[PDB]
Symmetry: none
């Protein structure tokens, strides 16, 4: 026996540069990925997230995401101990369509904010959200 | 002159406790709200966000949001100098439907993460996003 | 068995408003405080921190600190499951002498940043470290 | 004319593996480093921090620090817009003597937490503090 997150799914409709987009995101457990174990000893299966972005009949992007897609902007130590939690439509900017992404520490409500930016011609980029602290 | 943000809008479809929900969010400039003046001297008009959540023919929640809806969990100094940027469907939890919310500081890339949780019977709650630090 | 942390101690010399200060901080296990039990089942004894701040022959502040001194700015759920880890001289500001403070969760590298500000006339205030997010 | 931070200085005495250490830290403006400009247009001179760690007659470490010493664990975009604010003694761990370090956004109270670990034989390592977010 081992821990399995529920299958989350959401469809978002929005406009970008005056054109209508449809964004379908589907999270499912991925049994082929390495399992993630916590300090307590409970083993968790990691997830994959399919992001299917379309503009009319055209498919702008159809990618299967895993936490490893953020290996270029997240240190291996925290990335190995975390699981892919979610990818959600956030906003549109002059750069492109921005998605909020998160990897979370299993058995807790703790997560690291990340972002996926997709241009109108399907060029995709990953950025880690920098968290700054204020004293007063 | 008097700077204002573009009108962002998005519609999200998702399931919660096995029932289908439709979430429409509309950000527009609100000329009736107090203006926000930055250190440079540029005056910005603040925004209102209408969140219309429905479950079939029923309307679970239909609220006009402003940064003042977060006055119970954000200090007045930071809140007066910021503008309501966005309210985004994030995920579903046993508590309720969670929305990611943010207020930003004009002419910068800085913003404060907040959250709105709505139950299936329309009970709404506001929270500030807190942090823990992880090292090695 | 009953786990406990080592006794940490440090003495810091610094200037504030042109006057020389001596700051002695001593962490010791406090057997009189309620124990902290983690998810695994290991019970940890909590700590007390004595902060002795002096300016020449005068004692500006001599307080015994516990995690309960931060009950006004930390929720009881998180505070009951954590242990007082440390209080550290950080810097001087126009407000006062700032100390970095932290409460940690046993058997993990997670901890919550907090702060103690002490004025030249010994008026002390507690704050929670908040955050803003920066992207691109 | 241009902005200049005040010269901060602090001496800390502590024990590590049963031996007495003396740690002197001195922050001064460094006119030779590139200046840092904010969104408003105010130019700030960056700082250097001399950390002089001794154990009796021996000098364990005597290094001049700049924000560029953290280039391996902080992205160039945020590092270029920030200035070295401080390096302070935090605690001792089995790895070594840990210092809390911070780079801050000029004209604000915003900073990024970092850490310097120094072993008893002077081997030094840099780590960025990972900030995690909690929703409830």
């Amino acid at each position: 026996g081992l821990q399995r997150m529920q299958t989350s799914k959401s469809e978002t409709d929005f406009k970008f540069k005056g054109k209508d987009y449809h964004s379908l995101v589907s999270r499912t457990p991925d049994d082929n990925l390495p399992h993630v174990t916590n300090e307590l000893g409970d083993t968790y299966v990691d997830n994959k997230i399919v992001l299917h972005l379309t503009r009319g009949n055209e498919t702008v992007l159809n990618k299967t995401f895993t936490k490893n897609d953020f290996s270029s902007v997240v240190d291996a130590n925290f990335l190995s101990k975390s699981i892919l939690e979610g990818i959600v439509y956030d906003k549109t900017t002059p750069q492109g369509i921005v998605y909020a992404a998160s990897v979370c520490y299993p058995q807790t409500d703790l997560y690291m904010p990340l972002s996926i930016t997709i241009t109108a011609d399907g060029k995709m980029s990953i950025q880690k959200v920098d968290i700054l602290e204020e004293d007063y």
